Amino acid sequence: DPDDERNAFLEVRAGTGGDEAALFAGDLFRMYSRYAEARRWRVEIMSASEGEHGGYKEIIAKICGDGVYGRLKFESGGHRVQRVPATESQGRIHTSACTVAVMPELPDAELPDINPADLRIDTFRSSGAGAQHVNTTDSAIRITHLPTGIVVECQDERSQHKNKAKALSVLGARIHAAEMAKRQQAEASTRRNLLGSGDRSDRNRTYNFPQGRVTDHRINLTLYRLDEVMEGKLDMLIEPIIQEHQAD
Amino acid sequence: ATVNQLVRKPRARKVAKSNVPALEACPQKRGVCTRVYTTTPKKPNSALRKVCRVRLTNGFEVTSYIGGEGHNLQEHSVILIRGGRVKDLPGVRYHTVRGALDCSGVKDRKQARSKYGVKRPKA
Amino acid sequence: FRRIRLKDPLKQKQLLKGLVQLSEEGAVQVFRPISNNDLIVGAVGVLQFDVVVARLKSEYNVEAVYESVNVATARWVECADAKKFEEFKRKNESQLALDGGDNLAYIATSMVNLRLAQERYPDVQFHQTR
RNA sequence: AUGUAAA
RNA sequence: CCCGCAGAAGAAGCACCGGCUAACUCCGUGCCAGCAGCCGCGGUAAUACGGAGGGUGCAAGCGUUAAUCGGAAUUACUGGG
C-alpha cells in the first residue's frame, strides 16, 4: 500500500504534571531519535517549546523518508510517566502523562482551476452614485458558482472588467478560505482522534520505571527492558501489533 | 425557649428536598438516553466512567451512570433509569437498569446477578 | 423473511403486543430470539407489505422499512417431552428462540443444523401446530 | 520571590 | 373434608463476606477493567473488581429503587442554644 510508504508528522505534547511530564516527553524525542538513527531517518526540528527542568510543553516535527507513517499511526495516544523525578524534594514515585499524535503526509493539491462554464456572471449596471456614466452602462458583474452556489459582487467601480478581475480574485480567495477551513477542521478532527483529553487515563501504552517493565494495552508485551526502548531498538514493541493488525 | 414567640410564630419542621428530583416520588423512569461518553471522576478515582445524558419522558434532563462491563448503546435504545447517587461524578445521581429494556445484560456474569440483569446459569 | 428493528425506538410495546397479536394467524407468526432485539416476521407467502400497511392503525405506529437479511427455512416446530428437553436447553442455551405461542423449535439457520437436530433424536409425539 | 502533582 | 393407587417419585432459590454488620482463601488483570449506603479499594502478593471453592443470612421469596417515621435532643412544649 502507498499509505504505508508515506512520511509523517510527530506531535509530542505535555499532559498532566508540567515539567515532570515535560521531561518524560523530552526523553521520547530521544527514544524515537535513537529508534530513527538505527534505520537512517531524518528528524525535523520544526517545532518546539521548552520546560523548566528540561523537557517540553508541546513539540511538533517532520520525519521524511520512505515509510515513516505506520509506526506514527500506531503510536497516537497517551504515555504514562511513573518515576522518581528530579524536581522533587520528597523522593516518591509520581505519575504524569504525555500525548503523541502521528499525522500522515496529505500532500497539498491546492488551487483548482477557476472554470468559466460552471459559474455564470451577470452584467448589470450596478448601484452607487454621482455620474452620468454611472447609470447608463453596467458595472455589476456578479459571479455565481454552479457547484457551490456562491455569488461574488464587485458592483465595484469605473467599468465591469476590472470588476471581473476583482470578482475572480474574491472567488479564488473564498475557495482557498473554504477549503483550508475544512482542512483545519479535517486536521482538527484527526488531531482529536490522535489525542484524547490528556489526563492520566490508559491509552494503549504505559511506562513503569521503578518496576523495570512496560505494559501495552493492545498487543501488550512483558518486556521489562525499557532500556532497549530508551536507546532505540524497540522493534519488539511495534512489530507484534503490526502482526495482529494485518490479521484484521 | 421563649414560648410566647412559639405562640406567635409556630415551630416549623424543615422540609428537606429529595436526593432525586423524580417527579412526585417514582422508583423508575424511562428516557431517550442520548450522549454516551466517558467521564473523568473526582479526585481519588482515575477511571473512564461510562455515562449517558438521559432525556426523560417528563422533560427532565438527567445523566445516569452506566454500570457493568460492556454495553450496546449508541445515541438511541431507550432504557430504564433508577435512582441512587454514585459519589463519583458531580451531577450524576442515577443508575441504569440492566436486564430491562433494549440494553441487554452484562455478558458472562455469575455472582450478584439480581443486579445487572444476568439470568441464572442454566448448566 | 428479514426482521423487526424498531425504527423510532420509543414505545416498543405496540409491536411487542400488536404483532404477537397477529402471530396467532396462519400467515403471520412473530418469532422472538433471546437477545430481545431483531424479532423475526414469519410469513408463508412472499409479500410482507400486508403487515407494513397493517402497521398504520390506532395501536400501530412503527414503520420498520425492510432490507436484506438471510434466514433460510421456516423453523420446523418441535417440542420434546419431559426429562429430555432440560438437557436440550442446557447444552446450547444461546441457540434457542421463543415462538408465537411460547414454542422453542431449534433455530432456523441452515439444513445442516436441521440434520444435527435430527441426529440429536428428539423422540416425541409430533405436533405440527401449523 | 517561587517551589506542582501517590502513604 | 375423607379413602385408595404409581413411584423420593413433580417442587429452591436470592443477597452478602475490609469496618459499620453475621462470614475466608486462590487465580486473571493492575488508579485500565470495575464495586460502592458512608469511610472508601484497585499505582503488580486486593479478606473491597471479575471468576472458582467455601461460609453467612433470608426463604417461595431474595436484592435494588421510591415515599413516611424512629435513630434526629439536626425544629428541643415534654427535649437545644
UniProtKB/Swiss-Prot annotation, chain A:
Methylated by PrmC. Methylation increases the termination efficiency of RF1. It comes from the Bacteria. Its main location: cytoplasm. GO terms for biological process: translational termination. Transmembrane segments: none annotated. GO terms for cellular component: cytosol. The modification N5-methylglutamine is found at Q132. It is found in: Cytoplasm. The keyword Cytoplasm applies. GO terms for molecular function: ribosome binding; translation release factor activity, codon specific. Keywords: Cytoplasm, Methylation, Protein biosynthesis. Residues 181-210 are annotated as: Disordered. Belongs to the prokaryotic/mitochondrial release factor family. Peptide chain release factor 1 directs the termination of translation in response to the peptide chain termination codons UAG and UAA. This is Peptide chain release factor RF1. It comes from Escherichia coli (strain K12). The chain holds residues 104 to 351 of 360 of the full protein.
Curated annotation (Swiss-Prot), chain B:
Changing K42R: Confers streptomycin resistance but not hyperaccurate translation. InterPro entries: NA-bd_OB-fold, Ribosomal_uS12, Ribosomal_uS12_bac. The modification N6-acetyllysine is found at K107. The modification 3-methylthioaspartic acid is found at D88. Part of the 30S ribosomal subunit. Contacts proteins S8 and S17. Interacts with ArfA. May interact with IF1 in the 30S initiation complex. NCBIfam families: rpsL_bact (TIGR00981). This is Small ribosomal subunit protein uS12. It comes from Escherichia coli (strain K12). The gene is rpsL.
UniProtKB/Swiss-Prot annotation, chain C:
Its main location: cytoplasm. GO terms for cellular component: cytosol. It comes from the Bacteria. GO terms for biological process: maintenance of translational fidelity; regulation of translational termination; translational termination. Increases the formation of ribosomal termination complexes and stimulates activities of RF-1 and RF-2. It binds guanine nucleotides and has strong preference for UGA stop codons. It may interact directly with the ribosome. The stimulation of RF-1 and RF-2 is significantly reduced by GTP and GDP, but not by GMP. Belongs to the TRAFAC class translation factor GTPase superfamily. Classic translation factor GTPase family. PrfC subfamily. This is Peptide chain release factor RF3. The lineage of its organism: Bacteria, Pseudomonadati, Pseudomonadota, Gammaproteobacteria, Enterobacterales. The gene is prfC.
